[PDB]
Symmetry: C4
């Protein structure tokens, strides 16, 4: 009875951001069976929106939380759970097993992809309506990996960005196009982006826009623009001198559109943007050195204007508080004439920055745009680490 969703609207005008969801997972997990997670995101079905993350296969208070700084193990899985609840043993639904993921609903059913394996022999399994449908073996034998936030579909076609290869040099990035979990096509990355990790994507009538992480030489973010009908793409960098990776140099007065802006090598953080002419907003950590704080900045024409600077902003997380990965999502099934931009911020607690505990986990905060100019709060994780000692 359901039809595939088509991307037929533009973005709503973003004049501020309002609270959407928050799970307080570390606070609650001090005294409840909350799973250790990282790499969270949010994704909507036609009738519900849910939180997602990679479990570590242990609760926070469990003794197996010791060592959860590590990224890849056989005990990780993509889980989903109700919006603004914390991920518990009892409410977390496993989507698939592995240590790197994406997921999206096409209007009829959900596709979830999880990668598992050793570093030199990893494979993706593509699930559609809760069944495995297709599998993809590593092509570069060096940590096949994907977005860590939601994909986006148009008329049943759901593109997904993957990378396999070095994190500190040229790698082999591919864009796959799925329909009902089946591989329609893949293509190698083209354009001027020089390194791609952890793309954060959203869709609108123009196409699908992904803002990624250059882990090699860049502190400006690469952008992949996908046409899901033709199944083709382009890439470049955000031209603006408002640099949005982390760590990063200080903001210059001229950015770089077709190459990495230099100064910080071999590191980064997953992040996102909404690139929409005069309605452009960029997210970034407040700190240039570490994953602390989070702000949204209105930077007109950031994608294309190598002199562009902010004209409005909003603090999301104070610089005194830990942040983490961030990514885009939207509720494509909400009624109205425009798609309301949304995002989440991962609020990382524990190692490496808080090493009196032996675990690493996170909570989630998420916001959506308003056409009002709303007052701002700040949204910390809220747990007192000393309680875990």
């Amino acid at each position: 009875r359901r039809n595939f969703n088509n991307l037929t609207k533009g973005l709503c005008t973003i004049n501020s951001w309002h609270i959407y969801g928050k799970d307080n997972a570390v606070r609650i997990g001090e005294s409840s069976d909350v799973l250790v997670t990282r790499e969270p995101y949010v994704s909507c079905d036609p009738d519900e929106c849910r939180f997602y993350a990679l479990s570590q296969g242990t609760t926070i208070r469990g003794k197996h939380s010791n060592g959860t700084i590590h990224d890849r193990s056989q005990y990780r899985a993509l889980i989903s759970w109700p919006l603004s609840s914390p991920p518990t043993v009892h409410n977390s639904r496993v989507e698939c097993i592995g240590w790197s993921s994406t997921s999206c609903h096409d209007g009829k059913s959900r596709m979830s992809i999880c990668i598992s394996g050793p570093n030199n022999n990893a494979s993706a399994v593509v699930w559609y309506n809760r069944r495995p449908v297709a599998e993809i073996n590593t092509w570069a034998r060096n940590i096949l990996r994907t977005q860590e936030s939601e994909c986006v579909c148009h008329n049943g076609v759901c593109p997904v960005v993957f990378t396999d290869g070095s994190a500190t040099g040229p790698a082999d990035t591919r864009i796959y196009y799925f329909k009902e979990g089946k591989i329609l096509k893949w293509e190698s990355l083209t354009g001027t982006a020089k390194h791609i990790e952890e793309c954060s994507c959203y869709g609108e009538r123009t196409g699908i826009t992904c803002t990624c992480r250059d882990n090699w030489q860049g502190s400006n973010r690469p952008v992949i623009q996908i046409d899901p009908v033709a199944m083709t793409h382009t890439s470049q960098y955000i031209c603006s001198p408002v640099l949005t990776d982390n760590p990063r140099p200080n903001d210059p007065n001229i950015g770089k559109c077709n190459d990495p802006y230099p100064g910080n090598n071999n590191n980064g953080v997953k992040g996102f943007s909404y690139l929409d002419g005069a309605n452009t907003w960029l997210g970034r950590t407040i700190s240039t050195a570490s994953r602390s704080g989070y702000e949204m900045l209105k930077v007109p024409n950031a994608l294309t204007d190598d002199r562009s600077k902010p004209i409005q902003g909003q603090t999301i997380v104070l610089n005194a508080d830990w942040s983490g990965y961030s990514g885009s999502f939207m509720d494509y099934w909400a009624e109205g004439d425009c798609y309301r931009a949304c995002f989440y911020v991962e609020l990382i607690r524990g190692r490496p920055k808080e090493d009196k505990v032996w675990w690493t986990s996170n909570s989630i905060v998420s916001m959506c745009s308003s056409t009002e100019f709303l007052g701002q709060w700040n949204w910390p994780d809220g747990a007192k680490i000393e309680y875990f000692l």
Copy 2:
């Protein structure tokens, strides 16, 4: 397929009150993952009635329960859960994030409103069928706030009372009218009520009646009467000398219809009444000094008769036991020829009255009316505070 509910019945004749629900949350939370809450209420959908409250983002036994006397933080959310279960991490569904709320079902879907932010920059987000639809910024920059119990709808129009401004002097109260989460209209408070907080509302064929709290000078309660078709209102006070705020003076022989009855300033408690001629019943704490005990009193024509006194009553909570906020709700979808009046009482435990623990929480008891003259019990929270030490 569903239609908006219309208020087409009068109240049933209230000859006594019968037990409806009770969650025993503090008893159970001594040994289970029960969330710390306050400001509870009850609200019905066409097929289910649920408990609601503002979580504090921690369980009672969790170490983060320390400090939960505080009213506003980033860790609060409106939650709902099944009738007479306690609010646990596992059964509590988040309706929205914030520290002041209302919620109601219009017959088709539920509207929930949560306010969040710092005191000088708060904002309401209006959710409808589990999606954000509208946002309202603070207009007086001083703790924008709302009912803390259910709203009521007629033909899709759901009025809600908000206040922004001082709690100890004139403030800016507005009545908003929503349909499908969209703002149809708002108006400033009119009439003779001099201060409005925390309105408790119910609907019937005559219109929507809200009984509120005058926190400034009054120990009689203000009343707002709303016509949800014309989208207009009036206000006054309950005229009766049976005073129903807390703390309060002793009952005189002449009440006040159009001004606060004096003697207690800068305090109050959320409460309620059913104002229906000879079928009028008022709730109040038994104590005139503190939030202890709870009784219902049949006070004919209390709204309009400044000499009216009780002719019948029922003890709900003994004066030896702690009470708290109270509010009205009804199951507008129950079959029959009349709407059965219902209410809840918040049973506050912990601080400030029980300061050997470091938390503040509550449980819920709720009653509905009977046309029988039923025997009365009393309904304490039932937890032994010493067990938490």
Copy 3:
């Protein structure tokens, strides 16, 4: 779309009993949030069968389990939960608040009745499809009380037996007839039963048969036979000298049809029978002194034959193990040409017999009949009380 169920079948031939459900609640509750209960039963809906009991408003490991030998408090409620799971905070659905109950499904919706109040002022609230519909005040001001197992309906009419008055002398027993929760009729007890408590009922094409407890002078069980169409009844005792109350005298050779068989006063236990000519089976504790063991005995024509003795049996619980209340239920919606007799046994743990713990709780075992002659096991609670010390 659903129709009321009609009692159109006879009982299946009972040649043995097979295991139906068992929750292991005390074993599991040693280390999980299992509610303290007593007075359990089983009842079916058209699409599911569930366990029921009266919660005590605390978990077993919780400190509020101390004192749960007591029968009546404001913290009790009728709960239901999935067959063979234990009653936990998370899976227990509250049907209504109180300390004596019954419940049954009529084919369209479920009626649940809970009595609450002080001993001299108790009241029943009748819920239908999860809403309160009717209320009944105490008529004798002495612990209004009901079946503690399921009722039975025919063409929408659901009879329920209540008692109010002394437990150690003549009392005021009434049979109420409900439809959609509304009172159609009530009548005073007639016939030769001299005292009635805690009736256990089942239905078949002949009518509704209830086996009760004479707490005053009898150790034979009273029987109430109800015609749910005419809404009339008769009463007598089981004539057989196989005595089935507890405590009780030893079995004589002549029973009593119209008066209590003497020797034990002012005590008893809830129990049951299936009275069906040559297909008659009686349940009883094995011990004549205490609530220990449980057996089923095939006693042809027990109702009417004052010389009848057993011709077959089955041990359910060894005499070395604690038992408790027992009662009848059937899955009236199972396909086939006959109704399969079922029963449960409450396996009481803790006080008064095991007083090294400070609580009283139970688990459940339940059996249904087979037309095979199946091998027998025995079914203890299975918890080691020493683990709770």
Copy 4:
């Protein structure tokens, strides 16, 4: 509306195995209410696939976990729970009570069978759509027992293999044929298999193939081939010299088709195979001495070729890690032109191999086939036993 499923497809070509599900139950159960289990399996409904196992009626951290090496007690039950979650008190649905089981969906509803009783008087109860339908008494009075993994249905007919009698000599094996839980037929075992335990079955257009355990003299596995239309069967052994029981001799160069391959008596392990000409894959423990490691081996024509050796393989569990029972299942309702072979491995932890704890439990890993040649990982339980001390 639903129709019975018909076995109309062949197996997909198996070129490797991909991860399907993993529950990490022992890791999570270190700090959560995870039930002690053993004898797990997986089985699909038309709209969901679930994990199954025999509970021990206690959590792992509960004190009643002491003694759970024992196989048969009144506290065991067949439970099911969501794929890749662990079996908790809160998510485990009881299918039936007992200590040996099978279960399968016929396309319309699920049949579950549980055996309970003492060793000399056990009985099976056959449940269909969650109601008991048929019962089978022991025929040899010596531990009536069944598959411990899913059955398979065709056009509503679901065969199930049972054994009653000695585990160390000739026994009485029967194949029962059920439809809607009713016994259509049973027959005694025929063919050249000399002892049958714990059959693991799958279906395809050819019929139903079961790979079993010869506990008496054989270290090759018996095979039962069932025609579910004619309701007849044959039996033999896997002819290949790649021996797949445990413990077992080393692989010779000539296997045995019609008799046990000798060297190890009175022991074995439940296991499985997919027997499909050149697409044949066998599972086995890596160790020849103990239940450690697990591998899949491609052995062309293993069923019929007494010289056949492996031509491809995949490690599932390293020899350094504990394994356990293994069995077959498939998602018969997945779209496509072939049935994708799947299996699970029970990862046993605790006694007897790890006797510093007093319990025995397990977790689950499960895989399905791919037509790609995917990289391999290994999939241990992942718990650190020292944490439980």
